[PDB]
Amino acid sequence: DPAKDATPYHVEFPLFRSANMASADKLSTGVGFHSFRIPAVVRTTTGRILAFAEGRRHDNRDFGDINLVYKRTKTTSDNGATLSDWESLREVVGSGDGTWGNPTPVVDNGTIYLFLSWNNGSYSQKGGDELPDGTITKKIDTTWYGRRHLYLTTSTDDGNTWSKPQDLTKELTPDGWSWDAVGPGNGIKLSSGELVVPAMGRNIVGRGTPGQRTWSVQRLNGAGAEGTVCETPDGKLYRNDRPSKAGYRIVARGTLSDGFSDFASDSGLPDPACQGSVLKYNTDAPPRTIFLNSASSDSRRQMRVRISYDADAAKYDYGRKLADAPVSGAGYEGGYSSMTKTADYKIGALVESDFFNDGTGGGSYRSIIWRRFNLSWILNGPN
Ligand SMILES: O=C(O)[C@]1(F)O[C@@H]([C@H](O)[C@H](O)CO)[C@H](O)[C@@H](O)[C@H]1F
Ligand SMILES: *[C@]1(C(=O)O)O[C@@H]([C@H](O)[C@H](O)CO)[C@H](O)[C@@H](O)[C@H]1F
Ligand SMILES: [Ca+2]
Ligand SMILES: [Cl-]
């Protein structure tokens, strides 16, 4: 791999700082957040980087009052290289005391499309959870009021402002569903121009052209709830999803016109039942797909970034442990992740981190780390 010839480069620092941290991130209104979790990142066509997260107001739990927050790089050409290159925290949407989450952006010229999930603030995935005011949650159900909704918000000004989110549940989530998720992480634009956004049991597919997109659903029997998608070097689609039980990533390959294979466990990619991320890096010799998850069947703290050179992303190298370049003072790193390719030819990654001050409890502060590294950094890892 000729990219190994570059000097290894890596930088890493917290970008979304929980309430316990010195420079805890708050909106300009004064509204702060206990925890940030569920990252999504995209480089726009200007080179600006947009980083999204769930701002979890009161504790780290997946329900209750959660706002969709973000940061942009200050300019289109700084590549988020230092903390001072990032704007202050902003909000995409935070209306109501319900949950706005699952950021899943896709860039289309320019327009950034950001798909989100939402639930009512009286409901949770399991039900029976206690809220700050003493209310007990109802379990997410199939009713309009109590089901998981799918929203779309758009930016046509490089992420500066966002349209009021539009509820596309009736159009893009099957009737009768209760739980739902989009991404989280990112959607993609194919070499042939279609937009493909991974979601629970389905792709959301944007046909048409830039400036005139039309959305529909490609259902995928056996897909995960939290999916990732990319275009492999052979031109086909590749779903690499979180499994329902700890063990291994589940994978399927297909096309928009012919559909997908069934999903199968990939024994080369252990996973502890956690979200992952995938990135098409380049098309020229040699073609590369990047994959990032916790490379373990029982821990989220074994984050590993990897490269596949296969036309179908069948097999990956060992890659490199993110712990080889650890961050201090921002918790124990590991969990959900998102990757993009920066305009200065780095991998830019967001990774969850957990202070663990309340163990697995709701009071444990969660932060999100930003990382940049070149391919060389991965390739020069001790395997
Ligand atoms: O509901 C919230 O989280 C909030 F506290 O109020 C939201 C909103 O003004 C109200 O919920 C009504 O839409 C803000 O967008 C949030 O930043 C925050 F201030
Ligand atoms: C995530 C997690 O940290 O495990 O889990 C998902 C969801 O519960 C699982 O995919 C099972 O359906 C949450 O939606 C997400 O917020 C995060 F908690
Ligand atoms: Ca809110
Ligand atoms: Cl999910």
Give a verbal description of the structure.
The protein is an all-beta fold and 383 residues long. It has one domain (1-383). The protein has helices at residues 169-172, 375-379; strands at residues 10-16, 35-43, 49-56, 66-72, 90-93, 99-107, 112-119, 123-124, 138-139, 149-155, 166-167, 188-189, 195-199, 202-209, 212-219, 229-231, 237-241, 247-255, 259-260, 264-271, 277-282, 288-294, 303-308, 320-321, 332-341, 347-354, 366-373. The strands form seven sheets. Strands 16, 17, 18, 19 and 20 form a five-stranded antiparallel sheet that branches. The protein has a four-stranded antiparallel sheet with strand order 1-27-26-25. The chain has a four-stranded antiparallel sheet with strand order 2-3-4-5, with no helix packed on it. Strand 21 and strand 22 (288-294) form a beta hairpin. The chain is globular and about 60 Å long. 49% of the residues are buried. The chain binds ligand K99, the ligand *[C@]1(C(=O)O)O[C@@H]([C@H](O)[C@H](O)CO)[C@H](O)[C@@H](O)[C@H]1F, calcium ion (CA) and chloride ion. GO terms for molecular function: exo-alpha-sialidase activity; metal ion binding. Its EC number is 3.2.1.18. Belongs to the glycosyl hydrolase 33 family. Ca(2+) binds at residues 65, 67, 94, 96. It catalyses: Hydrolysis of alpha-(2->3)-, alpha-(2->6)-, alpha-(2->8)- glycosidic linkages of terminal sialic acid residues in oligosaccharides, glycoproteins, glycolipids, colominic acid and synthetic substrates.
